[PDB]
Amino acid sequence: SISARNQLKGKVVGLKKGVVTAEVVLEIAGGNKITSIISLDSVEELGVKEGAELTAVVKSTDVMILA
Amino acid sequence: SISARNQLKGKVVGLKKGVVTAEVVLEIAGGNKITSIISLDSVEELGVKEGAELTAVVKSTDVMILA
Amino acid sequence: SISARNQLKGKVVGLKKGVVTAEVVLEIAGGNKITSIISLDSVEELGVKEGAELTAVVKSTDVMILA
Amino acid sequence: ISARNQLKGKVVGLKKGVVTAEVVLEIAGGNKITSIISLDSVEELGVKEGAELTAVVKSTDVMILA
Amino acid sequence: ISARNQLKGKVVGLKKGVVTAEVVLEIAGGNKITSIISLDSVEELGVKEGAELTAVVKSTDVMILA
Amino acid sequence: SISARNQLKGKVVGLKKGVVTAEVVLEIAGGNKITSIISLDSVEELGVKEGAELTAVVKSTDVMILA
Ligand code: MOO
Ligand code: MOO
Ligand code: MOO
Numbered sequence: 528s529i530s531a532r533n534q535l536k537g538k539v540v541g542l543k544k545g546v547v548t549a550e551v552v553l554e555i556a557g558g559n560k561i562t563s564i565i566s567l568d569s570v571e572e573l574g575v576k577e578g579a580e581l582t583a584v585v586k587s588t589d590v591m592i593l594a
Numbered sequence: 595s596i597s598a599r600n601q602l603k604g605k606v607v608g609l610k611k612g613v614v615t616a617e618v619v620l621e622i623a624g625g626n627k628i629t630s631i632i633s634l635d636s637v638e639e640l641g642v643k644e645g646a647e648l649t650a651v652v653k654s655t656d657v658m659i660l661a
Numbered sequence: 662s663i664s665a666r667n668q669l670k671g672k673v674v675g676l677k678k679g680v681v682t683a684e685v686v687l688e689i690a691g692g693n694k695i696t697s698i699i700s701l702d703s704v705e706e707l708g709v710k711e712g713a714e715l716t717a718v719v720k721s722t723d724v725m726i727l728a
Numbered sequence: 729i730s731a732r733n734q735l736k737g738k739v740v741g742l743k744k745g746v747v748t749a750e751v752v753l754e755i756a757g758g759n760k761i762t763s764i765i766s767l768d769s770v771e772e773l774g775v776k777e778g779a780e781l782t783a784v785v786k787s788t789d790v791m792i793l794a
Numbered sequence: 795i796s797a798r799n800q801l802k803g804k805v806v807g808l809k810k811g812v813v814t815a816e817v818v819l820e821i822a823g824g825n826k827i828t829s830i831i832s833l834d835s836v837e838e839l840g841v842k843e844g845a846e847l848t849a850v851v852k853s854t855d856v857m858i859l860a
Numbered sequence: 861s862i863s864a865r866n867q868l869k870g871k872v873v874g875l876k877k878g879v880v881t882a883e884v885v886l887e888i889a890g891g892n893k894i895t896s897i898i899s900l901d902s903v904e905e906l907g908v909k910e911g912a913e914l915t916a917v918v919k920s921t922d923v924m925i926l927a
């Protein structure tokens with residue numbers, strides 16, 4: 528119910544922990560890949576792991592268009 | 595060749611022009627929908643129209659994770 | 662259950678609808694005013710109105726420090 | 729500045745990485761604000777625990793949860 | 795402020811919508827900067843053509859093209 | 861050919877690699893310093909190095925006005 532209009536359901540296939548940030552790579556429907564860099568705290572708090580089923584969220588105003 | 599790690603190839607199915615911004619809705623592979631709000635200038639300059647084939651770009655650091 | 666680490670509860674004191682986006686000002690702890698600019702579409706589906714209790718959400722990576 | 733979200737608080741956490749850094753400020757009512765910025769900024773503004781600072785956020789970066 | 799991108803320029807365009815507004819500043823070397831902010835900010839900072847202002851951008855929002 | 865309206869040409873004067881992200885400082889017209897924090901992965905694939913000419917890109921919606 529949050530306004531972010533892009534919610535892409537997917538599966539974690541890559542995970543890399545840094546000191547402050549984290550990188551979560553999801554395999555989503557149709558064969559596309561989504562790359563997320565978020566805080567390492569949210570990554571540990573949400574219990575993300577390779578194979579977990581997750582949703583990638585993106586606010587519309589953060590989406591560019593390439594012709 | 596730009597760093598934005600999320601490039602989702604798709605087809606414009608919705609277009610709405612505002613005064614300063616624009617909303618471009620793409621149908622992408624696998625049946626997902628992407629919603630873009632960008633400037634109405636880039637929308638007119640790139641020549642976006644319903645049915646055009648476009649790529650949605652999203653910088654990794656703008657992607658959240660929902661468990 | 663989203664990685665976005667900042668989630669500030671409040672009540673809607675401001676609502677302005679545009680053509681593509683819309684403005685939502687929430688009053689949070691301490692009378693602090695939070696202003697959110699989102700899609701017109703999102704406000705309508707989330708049924709936002711003056712007095713509604715909603716939560717404002719911000720990804721850490723959008724949060725700057727002013728000294 | 730144009731960013732309309734400016735919240736005053738007290739540094740209650742600071743995590744320094746290699747490129748970025750986390751600052752956790754406690755603002756009015758016990759809410760905590762998490763900010764990830766550049767290490768460079770954390771060295772230059774003078775950020776440390778106990779310090780009073782303001783969290784700034786651009787409106788268009790704020791989502792709404794119903 | 796922590797945002798490390800602060801470019802000084804002169805307002806050469808201003809477009810007012812209902813909720814947001816476009817400001818186009820000309821900075822050093824003829825480059826133009828496009829910024830979409832809240833109408834509210836455009837009314838309060840005092841933005842108009844000819845005015846000198848600074849464009850601010852957070853590092854983590856800047857992409858790189860090779 | 862991307863909607864991102866700000867594209868500032870420059871030469872790399874700064875490069876710092878982290879674990880998940882990396883920092884790139886470009887020198888543009890007027891000696892102005894632009895700092896970009898992106899994914900470590902992106903810097904490696906784009907082969908970024910001191911002295912490289914690259915273009916910094918920013919979406920309008922991330923650009924604030926300081927008075
Ligand atoms: O309606 Mo949104 O929060 O700009 O995707
Ligand atoms: O040094 Mo990081 O890759 O910002 O945790
Ligand atoms: O490497 Mo990026 O520009 O943070 O997606």
Ligand code: MOO
Pocket residue numbers: 612613614615679680681682683811812813814815
């Ligand atoms: O009033 Mo708009 O929908 O920001 O052009």
Ligand code: MOO
Pocket residue numbers: 564565566567569570657658659663664665666667719720721722762
């Ligand atoms: O970058 Mo976060 O971990 O979604 O606040």
Ligand code: MOO
Pocket residue numbers: 729730731732733785786787788830831832833835923924925
């Ligand atoms: O008017 Mo702002 O810079 O989108 O908060």
Ligand code: MOO
Pocket residue numbers: 724725726764765766767769795796797798799851852853854
């Ligand atoms: O990410 Mo910064 O250090 O607020 O420009």
Ligand code: MOO
Pocket residue numbers: 590591592631632633634636637828862863864865866918919920921
């Ligand atoms: O919001 Mo834009 O039209 O990608 O600069």
